Design a protein around this nucleic acid. Structure first.
Ligand SMILES: [Zn+2]
Lengths: 144, 38, 207, 176, 59
RNA sequence: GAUAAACGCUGAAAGCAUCUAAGUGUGAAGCCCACCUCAAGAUGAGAUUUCCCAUUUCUUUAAGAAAGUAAGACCCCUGAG
RNA sequence: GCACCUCGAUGUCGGCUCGUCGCAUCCUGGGGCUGUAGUCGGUCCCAAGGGUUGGGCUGUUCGCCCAUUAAAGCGGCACGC
């Protein structure tokens, strides 16, 4: 037994970031945003304590889908009843519920009880404006 | 149409056209020579 | 658009002016007080509260008598709403009398059904029996639960579980009379409901 | 690209703007507007204006021919206009106009009404032949094709609606 | 300790591995436990080490 | 309303032709709505209207304990739609 | 065909009740060609939304026969239970 910082539940200070989505594909937005919400890019890990940040995503209507996948990435849901697949969605979700496209980051995280806490720090807005301007967020460029 | 895996011209006026991931044979000489790959 | 609640009384017959017998139900009404007007600016949609009877004053509460008190009536039992109506034309506290359905003649009637307790798997769904003789023992059973391979039972394999208690519309019925002085609409046909219940009556959706 | 380098001769009555990617063409009849790609460049040297482009692609050649043919359609449609005249064989078929309402008695128990958009008229000289005019070619083609789809011809007697010059084949089948 | 060294190394522009190659060219051989503790606490010393690792592989 | 097979309009690569790469349409009991029902334990637990406003102990005043109440609900009794 | 599998013990095919899925489609729906005049048809492409009868003779899987119907599909689910 020796000395490494097992950080505690009430020491970590969190921040608020703004990330645009104007013509960036889904995989790389979700990659950088999902690496943020676990508290990476800070030297104060635990694999327990929610050392993450808060992510706000703006302009979800203008996310690239490269080449095809506009008519092709058929999502699927089944509803536990016979004859019950509902392949209703497509790349339609860019138009209707561009918030919902909250699946391609919910996949990227673990499925513990921290992958349910750290999912509730996304706030994905299809438009271009916060409702959260009272908490002073900052901007992240992406050359990543 | 005729939908065959193998497709050849039939007349002098048969012209091979790609329209999608497909191969056509289109004739003004007869309507009998419409051909698909499938 | 047009909407009047009310009660259920019974069943009659009426000769029409050509002389044919027609089966006829009896629906009452009252004065018909509008309670609130819901707008997009405060509620996000557009509707109208409406309620039909007169309680005694022993049988309500200070929130109910505060909610009624911007219309100056007695406290009323059956408060419901109505959607899809272009408003104008509606002050707080009017009376939507029986006059509205004189020549409406095509009407959706939305009662609530009776109740019959636990019953068998036949009387809900009309599943047929098995044979009552030639040595069998399979008189009145609900069948087999499915195949063997999935190691479970699929959903919606219907079994026992209480008959009735849920609300059922019937579309495109006719109106026979409107008796304003006695507060009675007469309807051809059959209304789902026990007596003294509620019945909503609307102008039908399917033209 | 032997169409991609032919010269666009502008007659009298040609007024051309440049608004970002917009290339608008005024004139004696019409005000046709589009947009194009940034890989194309306009020219000067009065009224014969051509196109020269950044080359060294794999394609090199498609968008040249399309833009030259489309601007020749632009300039001709502003100047003259286009005609695609139709006919009515199958005796007992009519065509009547009350303003902008075609009535076609082609043997149904109807019907047949056909309305019109703005820049297209319908000229009916006699009870058979119908003429369609206007500015574009695409709009005129779609309206003429929608007229043809009401009753396209047959290979046995040849009723219905044609071009002025279709080649409708006749398969003289027996009476049984 | 690798994840914490990666985070605090990316804080100084160096990638997550070029510290290793840079320090082993500059002949510096700290255990990664002690680099983890310095990368958490001593920001000045960790930037000093990171600048010498920048200095080594700048050939 | 967007599609399937099919039919086109304009147009070049390939001075012609050509439904297609640029762009622009018609198109089925099928897909998504429209018809009836359930539905905020939708732990992302939503929204509106109306009703009710303060003793003791100090533990050391902290999102402390303890006690009689308000709006209101329940226990018990006569019953059935 | 082989013998991995179940011998301190796993019941045979039809019928009754109850269904569910696939598409190489029986009817209904949309199309292309014709050695398609019309009424009928032949073949091929898309398409699984719903529907698919009572009897007579055999223990029957098979079948044959009578009378109907828009039609009286082929299969998987321990040759379903
Ligand atoms: Zn040919």
């Amino acid at each position: 037994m020796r000395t490494t910082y097992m950080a505690k539940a009430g020491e970590v200070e969190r921040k608020w970031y703004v990330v645009d989505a104007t013509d960036v594909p889904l995989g790389r937005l979700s990659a950088v945003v999902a690496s943020v919400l676990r508290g990476k890019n800070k030297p104060t890990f635990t694999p327990h304590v929610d050392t993450g940040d808060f992510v706000i995503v703006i302009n979800a209507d203008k996310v690239k889908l490269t080449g095809k996948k506009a008519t092709d990435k058929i999502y699927y849901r089944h509803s536990m009843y016979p004859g019950g697949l509902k392949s209703v969605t497509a790349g339609e979700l860019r138009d209707k519920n561009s918030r919902r496209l909250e699946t391609s980051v919910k996949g990227m995280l673990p499925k513990n009880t921290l992958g349910r806490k750290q999912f509730t720090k996304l706030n994905v807005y299809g438009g271009a404006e916060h409702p959260h301007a009272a908490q002073q967020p900052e901007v992240l460029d992406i050359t990543n | 149409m005729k939908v065959r895996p193998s497709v050849k011209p039939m007349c002098e006026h048969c012209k091979v056209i790609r329209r999608k991931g497909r191969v056509m044979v289109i004739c003004p000489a007869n309507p009998k020579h419409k051909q698909r790959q499938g | 658009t047009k909407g009047i609640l009310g009660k259920k009384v019974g069943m009659t017959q009426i000769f029409t002016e050509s002389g044919e017998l027609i089966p006829v139900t009896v629906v009452e009404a009252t004065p018909n007080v509008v309670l609130q007007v819901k707008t997009v600016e405060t509620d996000g949609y557009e509707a109208i509260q409406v309620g039909y009877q007169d309680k005694r004053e022993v049988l309500s509460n200070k929130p109910a008598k505060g909610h009624v008190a911007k219309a100056n009536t007695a406290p009323k039992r059956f408060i419901k709403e109505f959607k899809n109506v272009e408003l104008g034309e509606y002050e707080v506290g009017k009376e939507i009398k029986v006059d509205v359905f004189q020549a409406g003649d095509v009407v959706d009637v939305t009662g609530t059904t009776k109740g019959k307790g636990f019953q068998g798997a036949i009387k809900r769904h009309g599943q047929s029996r098995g044979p009552m003789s030639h040595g069998s023992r399979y008189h009145r059973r609900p069948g087999s639960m499915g195949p063997v391979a999935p190691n479970r039972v699929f959903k919606n394999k219907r079994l026992a579980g209480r008959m009735g208690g849920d609300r059922v519309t019937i579309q495109n019925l006719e109106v026979v009379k409107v008796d304003v002085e006695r507060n009675v609409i007469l309807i051809k046909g059959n209304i789902p409901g026990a007596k003294k219940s509620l019945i909503t009556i609307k102008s039908a959706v399917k033209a | 690209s032997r169409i991609g380098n032919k010269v666009v001769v502008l007659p009298a009555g040609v007024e051309i703007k440049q608004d970002g990617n917009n290339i608008t063409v005024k004139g004696p009849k019409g005000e046709l507007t589009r947009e194009f790609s940034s890989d194309i460049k306009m020219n000067i040297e009065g009224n014969e204006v051509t196109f020269t482009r950044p080359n060294d692609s794999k394609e090199m050649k498609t968008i040249h021919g399309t833009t030259r043919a489309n601007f020749n359609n632009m300039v001709v449609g502003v100047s003259e206009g286009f005609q695609k005249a139709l006919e009515l064989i199958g005796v007992g078929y009519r065509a009547q106009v009350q303003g902008n309402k075609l009535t076609l008695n082609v043997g149904y128990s109807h019907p047949v009404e056909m309305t019109a958009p703005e820049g297209v008229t319908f000229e009916v000289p006699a009870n058979t032949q119908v003429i369609v005019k206007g500015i574009n070619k695409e709009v005129v083609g779609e309206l003429a094709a929608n007229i043809r789809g009401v009753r396209p011809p047959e290979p046995y007697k040849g009723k219905g609606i044609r071009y002025v010059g279709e080649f409708v084949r006749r398969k003289e089948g027996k009476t049984g | 300790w690798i994840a914490r060294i990666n985070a605090a190394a990316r804080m100084n522009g160096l990638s997550y591995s070029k510290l290793m190659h840079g320090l082993k060219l500059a002949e510096i051989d700290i255990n990664r436990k002690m680099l983890a503790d310095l990368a958490v606490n001593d920001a000045a010393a960790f930037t000093a080490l990171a600048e010498q690792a920048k200095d080594a592989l700048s050939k």
